[PDB]
Amino acid sequence: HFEEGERVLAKHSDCFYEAKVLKVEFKDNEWKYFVHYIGWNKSWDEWIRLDCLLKHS
């Protein structure tokens, strides 16, 4: 699990991008994370699932 404001790696297409978690939600027995991709337009902000997130380090 991840927290609001946490720096994470987020998978988009084929690879992982530096990202920040903006919002956390739980619905239909699953966690979703609204992320912002660091150094990218706000327009790319999106909801992603747990299996597309990676902790740093």
Numbering used by the authors: 51 to 107
Authors' own words:
H3K4me3 (residues 1–9) and H3K36me3 (residues 31–41) exhibited detectable binding to MRG2 chromodomain (residues 41–123) (Kd values: 0.8 mM for H3K4me3; 0.69 mM for H3K36me3). To obtain the information regarding the specific MRG2 residues that are important for recognition of the histone marks H3K4me3 and H3K36me3, we determined the co-crystal structure of MRG2 and the methylated H3 peptides. The proteolyzed samples were analyzed using mass spectrometry (MS) analysis to determine the protein sequence, resulting in the identification of a region containing the chromodomain with residues 53–123 of MRG2 as suitable for crystallization. MRG2 complexes with the H3K4me3 and H3K36me3 peptides were obtained, but the complexes with the H3K27me3 and H3K9me3 peptides could not form crystals under the same conditions, consistent with the ITC results. The crystals of MRG2 with H3K4me3 or H3K36me3 were diffracted to 1.68 and 1.65 Å, respectively. In both structures, the MRG2 chromodomain contains mainly four beta-strands. However, the predicted alpha-helix located at the C-terminus is missing in the electron density map. The tri-methylated lysine projects into the aromatic cage formed by the His62, Tyr67, Tyr87, Trp90, and Trp94 residues of the MRG2 chromodomain. The co-crystal structures clearly indicate that the chromodomain of MRG2 can directly bind to tri-methylated H3K4 and H3K36, and provide strong evidence that the aromatic cage of the MRG2 chromodomain and the associated residues are essential for the binding, the same as other chromodomain proteins. Consistent with the structure, the Tyr87Ala (Y87A) mutation in MRG2 disrupted its association with H3K4me3 and H3K36me3 peptides, supporting the idea that the hydrophobic pocket formed by the aromatic residues is essential for the binding, as with other chromodomain proteins.
MRG1 and MRG2 belong to the MRG protein family, with highly conserved members in fungi, plants, and animals. Members in this group have the same domain organization, with a chromodomain (chromatin organization modifier domain) near the N-terminus, and a MRG domain near the C-terminus. Firstly, via their chromodomain, MRG1/2 proteins act as readers that recognize methylated H3K4 and H3K36. In addition, MRG1/2 proteins bind to chromatin that contains tri-methylated H3K4 and H3K36 via their chromodomains, the bound MRG1/2 in turn stabilize the binding of CO and ultimately controls the activation of FT transcription.
